[PDB]
Design a binder for these strands. Structure first.
Ligand SMILES: [Zn+2]
Ligand SMILES: [Zn+2]
Ligand SMILES: [Zn+2]
Length: 84
DNA sequence: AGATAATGCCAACAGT
DNA sequence: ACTGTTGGCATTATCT
């Protein structure tokens, strides 16, 4: 089952390790706000990356597959499918 | 060299 | 089940 539950919100998890991994979220120190939406972040790079997502179209794309990716390394990993 | 910005990895999560 | 997303976070790249 999932006996372990978050104290802050109504969530449940199988084991204490994943429980703590979730429960830390409610208490992290986030000093970096996004000027678009009031969402907070721990590192400024994370905040700027989030700001990227507020743009409608997803920036990165595949030259051959014609897909759309939010982040550079995801496009790089997708490029591995064309090993020939 | 020291401070700050970007990026890659990872786990949690969610659309299909 | 598959595979995209997200934010956190350590590490790397760029700026001063
Ligand atoms: Zn919670
Ligand atoms: Zn925002
Ligand atoms: Zn492709």
């Amino acid at each position: 089952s999932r006996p372990f539950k978050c104290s802050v919100c109504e969530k449940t998890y199988k084991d204490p390790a994943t429980l703590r991994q979730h429960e830390k979220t409610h208490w992290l120190t986030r000093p970096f706000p996004c000027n678009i939406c009031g969402k907070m972040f721990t590192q400024r790079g994370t905040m700027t990356r989030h700001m990227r997502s507020h743009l409608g179209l997803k920036p990165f794309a595949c030259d051959e597959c014609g897909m759309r990716f939010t982040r550079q390394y995801r496009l790089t990993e997708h490029m591995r499918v064309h090993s020939g």
